[PDB]
Every structure is written in C-alpha cells, then in structure tokens.
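Recap quiz, item 2
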Amino acid sequence: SFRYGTIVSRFKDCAALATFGHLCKITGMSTEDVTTWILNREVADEMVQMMLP
Amino acid sequence: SVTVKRIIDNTVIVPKLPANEDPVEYPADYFRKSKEIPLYINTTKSLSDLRGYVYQGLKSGNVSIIHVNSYLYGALKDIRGKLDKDWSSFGINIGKAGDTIGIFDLVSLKALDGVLPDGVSDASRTSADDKWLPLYLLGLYRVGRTQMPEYRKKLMDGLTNQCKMINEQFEPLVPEGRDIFDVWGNDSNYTKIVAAVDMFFHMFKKHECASFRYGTIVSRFKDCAALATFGHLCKITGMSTEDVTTWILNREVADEMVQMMLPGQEIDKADSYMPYLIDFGLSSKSPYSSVKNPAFHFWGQLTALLLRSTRARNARQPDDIEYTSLTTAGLLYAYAVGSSADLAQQFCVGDNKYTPDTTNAPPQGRDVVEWLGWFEDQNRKPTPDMMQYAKRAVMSLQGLREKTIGKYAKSEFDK
Amino acid sequence: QGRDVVEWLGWFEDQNRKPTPDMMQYAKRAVMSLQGLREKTIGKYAKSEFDK
RNA sequence: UUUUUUUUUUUUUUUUUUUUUUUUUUUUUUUUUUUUUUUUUUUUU
C-alpha cells in the first residue's frame, strides 16, 4: 500500500517510451510494425536514441 | 453446436456461462405435500386487552406484529357467510350445501409464548372493534406495498374508508419509506390473515364486512402480472385466447406462455387458492410474474401500447431479453390489428350487407399465416407504412417515466 | 438471410471492408436520444462515434 | 534544472441489485369537476 504516491517515481520522465507502448495498444500493431510507420527523419532519430541496447 | 474450435491453431474451446437454477413453484405441486395451510396465531389470551395493545402501540411506536395478528383473529372470528352452493379447491374441501363457514376455515395452530406488556392494557378503547380497526390493520398492507409519494395518497383513502357509520380519525404520524408497518409484509402469518380475508369476501361479495376487501385486494394475483397482461391483450386486441396464442412469434415468449398455462392450476377457477399463492406461502417463486415472464411481458405490453393502451404507458422494461427481435414482432401484431378493423353489420330491417361484393398490399384480416407470408415478401423488414403507424402511435405521449416500455417505444419509433 | 458469421463476413467483403451508410444510420438511430450519460462510459463513446 | 495525461495501479471497474415483486392500477362503487323550477346576449327602451 506504500506504492500509492511512491508510484510516480516509476518511469519518471520516460513519457516518450510510454507513448510508444500506448501507440502499439491503440493501433494494435506489433512493436516492429509500428516502427516501420515512422516517416520523419527526426522521429527515426529519437527512436534510435530510445532503443539503444 | 456441440463443438467449437479456434481456427488459428486447431484447438477446442468450450463456451460456458454460470448456472441459474432458481426455478418456479406451482400452487398444485404444494398440496401434493401438505393438506393444510398453517396459521400460527401465537397468543390466544384476552381479546379485549389486545384491542388496547394495538391501539396504544400504533399511536407512534413499535406495535408488535404478533399482537395485531392475535387481534385480527379475535376480531374477525365472525362465523358469518352462508355458503351458496359448494366450495372446493386443489382437493381441499371447505364447504358444502348450506354450510355456515367463517373466515378462518383453514388451519389455525398455536405458537410461541412470549408477550410484551402483560395482561390488561388501558381499558380506554370502547367496542367500535370489528367496525373499523380491522380495516386499518389490513389497510396498512396496501399502503406498505408501494414506495413512492403515492403512499400519502393511498393512506388518505384509508382514513376516509373508516367512516362507514364510524368516523374517527387517524393513528401514527411517521412517513413510510419502508420502516414502520412495512415489517408486516415479510410476516408469513400476517399475509395469511390478509389473503384469507380477501378470499372469504371474494366468495361473499354481498357481505357487510366485504368493505375490508379494499386494502386486502392487492393480494389477489400478487406476482401474477404476466397473467394480467395476457388478459389485457385479449381485451385490447379483441381476439380470443387461442388466436392471441398463435400470434406469439418468438421462441422465448412461447416457452413462457407454456410455463404459464400448465394444465392443473385452477387459474380460470372462480374462487380458488391459486391467486393467493404467494401470500398463503404456497409458492416461493411465482410462475406468473413479470420477472419469470420477461419476454412475454415486454412483447404483450408493447403491442398493447401500440394499440392504444393507457396501462402500458407505464409498464416496466425488463432486462436480458432480445429487444430488437421482440419489438419487431410486437409491431407486426399491432399493425395487423390496427389495419384490420372488425367492422360487421349487427342489426337490420330486412336489409343486410354481405361482404363478398395492390401488390404489396397487406393481408385482408388477422390470420397469422397470411401476415407471416406478407412479412417474408417484405424482406423480413418492417415497411414504411407500419413504421409510420408506430410513430403516430407513440408521438404525443407525454411525461413518460424512466425505464418504462412507453419510454422505450417513443424513443424507438419517434426520432 | 440469417445470423451466420461466414455469410455476413462475405457480405462485408463485398462492401470493401467498410461499414455501409445504412449501417451507420442503424447505429445513429440506436444512439440518438440517449439522455445524460457520464464520462468515460461506452455509452458516451457510442453517441460521439455514431451521432454526428 | 525541470517535467511536460489537473493519469495512476492493490484487487476492481451498470452513481446494478436479486428476497419476492413491479401501471406513483385498483373498480364495492360509479364515473359530463351536467343537471332541470322556469330559463338560457355579464340586452335594453
């Protein structure tokens, strides 16, 4: 129960990652199939940055 | 239907929903086990004292239900009522030729031994016993049934009925909302007293004390609304019980009808135990309720409405029935009766009219097969003419309540 | 004719996988004249989607 | 320097209750919030 309030530290300012998950569940597409619909240079860039191994 | 399979990987799934027993219980199938109906009149001590016990108790406070029961049995112990011909129901004999049977000529049996105040109360109250006090105690069962501001409009008609060569006043003061005298409804023995009062005076309509009936009337056919709606449909369509039966066009309405028309139930009998099946504790789940006839209730009451019933306006819309399928059925029936007027000459002066004298034109009369054939040829979809009939029927209905069939019907047909 | 999935899917095919204008009117009718409905319900969702 | 759901987790998710019911229906009645004595412009000479 100590989680209520301690929960907003989890993925704190990792919102971009969260919208990638969300975009998948809405389009219902695979993670890779969503990746292939990225059509702007600076959106590809950010994706590369977000996915570094 | 048995086997269903997931097509992606050829594996067998079995679809299943939770059980639902809670089955019906017929009047007849009860007297198969017991021959009597137990009336547990607890205390049988001092009848004059009880009159004061209930009077002072009702005058704001917690009057015991055990008390009033003991009172009512004492006050209504009039062995009046000259039996006209013969009285028998479900095998139990009650009357013969010229018998002088009273109102409690079904079982009495003594019970418990715990009483409240002890002995002689306040000798304050005169006779005026049987004259009005029993009417009131029975009259609170009528008022107790409801739960909307209609109470302070049905209790108003209680007080004005205790003046028939009487004229007194009132008793309690607290608003209802289920708290005061509403406890009594769930009393097996109290309800049994009310049901035996209604039954006695349904037979002895001419009797002086038959005024007790109004207040105890709401027990006759309690939880038998579906049966009432079937009668109403016959009256409003003008068709016979057989014809109406043939106009059932949904599988689950048919089932319900069959359930209701079980052969050995004495439902068409003049003076039977059947209408008091609930309050005499003969049944824990009426076969005849709206709850157990939801498809039939909706279908019957929707048609009734399209045909210009004023009752139906305010009927409850049930849950978990096929509204779409049911509604289009009801429409066909109403449209058919509303088109085909009966209209035949009845009287003459040696001068009669004889009836024998375009393509998508509706059938001549009110035969199901003719209309069924016509609906097929209409692509199994309701015509513009019948949709316009349904509109005209529902528009200009005013102030219809939430969750009624009237609200459903205006909303469906008058966009 | 009936209520069979294979059959209705084949008819949906014939309508290049997009809902018909009669279908849209059907759902329109089914949702218009729904009264006060609260936020984040499938009621609110359906009226927004089908009543415009 | 931030962060950028006036999002947030623990299950959950009819401002759903099942006890039976369900016309804010009771009709014993009886139903112009008609009534009789003419009369029948809130007409006058």
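The first helix of chain A runs from residue 15 to 27.
Residues 1, 3-4, 7-8, 12-13, 15, 18 of chain A lie near RNA strand D (CB under 10 Å from a C1').
End of item.
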